[PDB]
Amino acid sequence: KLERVDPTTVRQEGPWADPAQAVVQTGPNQYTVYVLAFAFGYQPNPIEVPQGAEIVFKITSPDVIHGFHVEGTNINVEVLPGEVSTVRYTFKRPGEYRIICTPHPFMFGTIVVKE
Ligand SMILES: [Cu+2]
């Protein structure tokens, strides 16, 4: 069901290698966001997306299992090394959202949804 990726090369080549290129416009009101869930943080940080846009999160791990839950939303997904977790969401409220990892409570990320 989930797309496969080589976890040993995910940080050197491909769409998760450069966090400055994590946000790719794939349509007029559509963005794909390549998120790396690693020990112990998120890449990019912060994730910046416009409000009302369809976001396609493509999340993967180069090490161990991580969680990807965006507080105040129903986004609650497991992130496995070598597998791509896909989350589709449209943020209707601008502001800052916290990304939470259940196994690592010291691991935090930020999403900024712009007006
Ligand atoms: Cu974690």
Side-chain angles (χ1 to χ4, degrees), residues 38 40 42 65-67 101 103-104 107:
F38 65 95
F40 297 98
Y42 295 98
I65 293 165
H66 300 281
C101 179
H104 317 121
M107 188 171 154

PDB file of all heavy atoms in Angstrom, residues 38 40 42 65-67 101 103-104 107, ligand 1:
ATOM      1  N   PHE A  38      12.896  12.313  11.500  1.00  0.00           N
ATOM      2  CA  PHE A  38      14.177  11.741  11.888  1.00  0.00           C
ATOM      3  C   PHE A  38      14.385  11.844  13.397  1.00  0.00           C
ATOM      4  O   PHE A  38      13.572  12.468  14.078  1.00  0.00           O
ATOM      5  CB  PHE A  38      15.307  12.459  11.127  1.00  0.00           C
ATOM      6  CG  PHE A  38      15.475  13.926  11.474  1.00  0.00           C
ATOM      7  CD1 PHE A  38      16.399  14.330  12.438  1.00  0.00           C
ATOM      8  CD2 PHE A  38      14.730  14.902  10.820  1.00  0.00           C
ATOM      9  CE1 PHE A  38      16.548  15.679  12.760  1.00  0.00           C
ATOM     10  CE2 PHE A  38      14.887  16.256  11.136  1.00  0.00           C
ATOM     11  CZ  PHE A  38      15.778  16.635  12.114  1.00  0.00           C
ATOM     12  N   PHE A  40      15.966  13.495  16.362  1.00  0.00           N
ATOM     13  CA  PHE A  40      14.571  13.566  16.851  1.00  0.00           C
ATOM     14  C   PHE A  40      14.008  14.923  16.519  1.00  0.00           C
ATOM     15  O   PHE A  40      14.065  15.858  17.331  1.00  0.00           O
ATOM     16  CB  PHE A  40      14.481  13.288  18.360  1.00  0.00           C
ATOM     17  CG  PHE A  40      14.921  11.901  18.749  1.00  0.00           C
ATOM     18  CD1 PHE A  40      16.202  11.673  19.237  1.00  0.00           C
ATOM     19  CD2 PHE A  40      14.050  10.824  18.645  1.00  0.00           C
ATOM     20  CE1 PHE A  40      16.610  10.385  19.596  1.00  0.00           C
ATOM     21  CE2 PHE A  40      14.456   9.539  19.005  1.00  0.00           C
ATOM     22  CZ  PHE A  40      15.738   9.325  19.463  1.00  0.00           C
ATOM     23  N   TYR A  42      11.844  17.187  12.873  1.00  0.00           N
ATOM     24  CA  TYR A  42      11.195  17.214  11.581  1.00  0.00           C
ATOM     25  C   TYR A  42      11.901  18.114  10.630  1.00  0.00           C
ATOM     26  O   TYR A  42      12.462  19.141  11.024  1.00  0.00           O
ATOM     27  CB  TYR A  42       9.749  17.661  11.739  1.00  0.00           C
ATOM     28  CG  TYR A  42       8.918  16.675  12.527  1.00  0.00           C
ATOM     29  CD1 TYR A  42       8.673  16.873  13.884  1.00  0.00           C
ATOM     30  CD2 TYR A  42       8.420  15.515  11.930  1.00  0.00           C
ATOM     31  CE1 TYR A  42       7.901  15.977  14.612  1.00  0.00           C
ATOM     32  CE2 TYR A  42       7.649  14.609  12.650  1.00  0.00           C
ATOM     33  CZ  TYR A  42       7.389  14.847  13.992  1.00  0.00           C
ATOM     34  OH  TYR A  42       6.664  13.954  14.737  1.00  0.00           O
ATOM     35  N   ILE A  65      10.951   4.303  13.524  1.00  0.00           N
ATOM     36  CA  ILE A  65       9.575   4.738  13.442  1.00  0.00           C
ATOM     37  C   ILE A  65       9.343   6.034  14.196  1.00  0.00           C
ATOM     38  O   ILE A  65       9.837   6.237  15.255  1.00  0.00           O
ATOM     39  CB  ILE A  65       8.607   3.651  13.897  1.00  0.00           C
ATOM     40  CG1 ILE A  65       8.649   2.496  12.923  1.00  0.00           C
ATOM     41  CG2 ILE A  65       7.198   4.172  14.020  1.00  0.00           C
ATOM     42  CD1 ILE A  65       8.014   1.233  13.444  1.00  0.00           C
ATOM     43  N   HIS A  66       8.594   6.906  13.587  1.00  0.00           N
ATOM     44  CA  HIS A  66       8.182   8.171  14.168  1.00  0.00           C
ATOM     45  C   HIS A  66       6.668   8.335  13.930  1.00  0.00           C
ATOM     46  O   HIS A  66       6.061   7.602  13.137  1.00  0.00           O
ATOM     47  CB  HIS A  66       8.975   9.348  13.568  1.00  0.00           C
ATOM     48  CG  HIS A  66      10.455   9.275  13.780  1.00  0.00           C
ATOM     49  ND1 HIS A  66      11.029   9.625  14.986  1.00  0.00           N
ATOM     50  CD2 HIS A  66      11.441   8.962  12.908  1.00  0.00           C
ATOM     51  CE1 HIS A  66      12.334   9.486  14.823  1.00  0.00           C
ATOM     52  NE2 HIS A  66      12.631   9.085  13.590  1.00  0.00           N
ATOM     53  N   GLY A  67       6.068   9.273  14.635  1.00  0.00           N
ATOM     54  CA  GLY A  67       4.652   9.602  14.465  1.00  0.00           C
ATOM     55  C   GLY A  67       4.551  10.951  13.810  1.00  0.00           C
ATOM     56  O   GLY A  67       5.489  11.736  13.905  1.00  0.00           O
ATOM     57  N   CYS A 101       5.080  13.612  17.830  1.00  0.00           N
ATOM     58  CA  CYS A 101       5.518  12.219  17.703  1.00  0.00           C
ATOM     59  C   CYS A 101       5.218  11.524  19.018  1.00  0.00           C
ATOM     60  O   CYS A 101       5.738  11.937  20.060  1.00  0.00           O
ATOM     61  CB  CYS A 101       6.998  12.131  17.356  1.00  0.00           C
ATOM     62  SG  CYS A 101       7.611  10.441  17.198  1.00  0.00           S
ATOM     63  N   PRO A 103       5.947   8.158  20.132  1.00  0.00           N
ATOM     64  CA  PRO A 103       7.062   7.495  20.849  1.00  0.00           C
ATOM     65  C   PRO A 103       8.122   8.448  21.438  1.00  0.00           C
ATOM     66  O   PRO A 103       8.711   8.114  22.466  1.00  0.00           O
ATOM     67  CB  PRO A 103       7.699   6.580  19.789  1.00  0.00           C
ATOM     68  CG  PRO A 103       7.211   7.064  18.494  1.00  0.00           C
ATOM     69  CD  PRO A 103       5.886   7.730  18.715  1.00  0.00           C
ATOM     70  N   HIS A 104       8.353   9.623  20.809  1.00  0.00           N
ATOM     71  CA  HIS A 104       9.370  10.580  21.255  1.00  0.00           C
ATOM     72  C   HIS A 104       8.710  11.897  21.684  1.00  0.00           C
ATOM     73  O   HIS A 104       8.475  12.766  20.848  1.00  0.00           O
ATOM     74  CB  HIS A 104      10.421  10.772  20.147  1.00  0.00           C
ATOM     75  CG  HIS A 104      10.829   9.479  19.511  1.00  0.00           C
ATOM     76  ND1 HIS A 104      10.663   9.265  18.153  1.00  0.00           N
ATOM     77  CD2 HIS A 104      11.299   8.342  20.076  1.00  0.00           C
ATOM     78  CE1 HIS A 104      11.066   8.023  17.935  1.00  0.00           C
ATOM     79  NE2 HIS A 104      11.456   7.428  19.061  1.00  0.00           N
ATOM     80  N   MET A 107      10.288  15.300  20.703  1.00  0.00           N
ATOM     81  CA  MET A 107      10.359  15.513  19.279  1.00  0.00           C
ATOM     82  C   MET A 107       9.189  16.389  18.849  1.00  0.00           C
ATOM     83  O   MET A 107       8.036  15.973  18.976  1.00  0.00           O
ATOM     84  CB  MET A 107      10.341  14.154  18.571  1.00  0.00           C
ATOM     85  CG  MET A 107      10.590  14.260  17.132  1.00  0.00           C
ATOM     86  SD  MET A 107      10.801  12.655  16.404  1.00  0.00           S
ATOM     87  CE  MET A 107      10.271  13.024  14.709  1.00  0.00           C
TER      88      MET A 107
HETATM   89 CU    CU B   1       9.950  10.513  16.752  1.00  0.00          CU
END
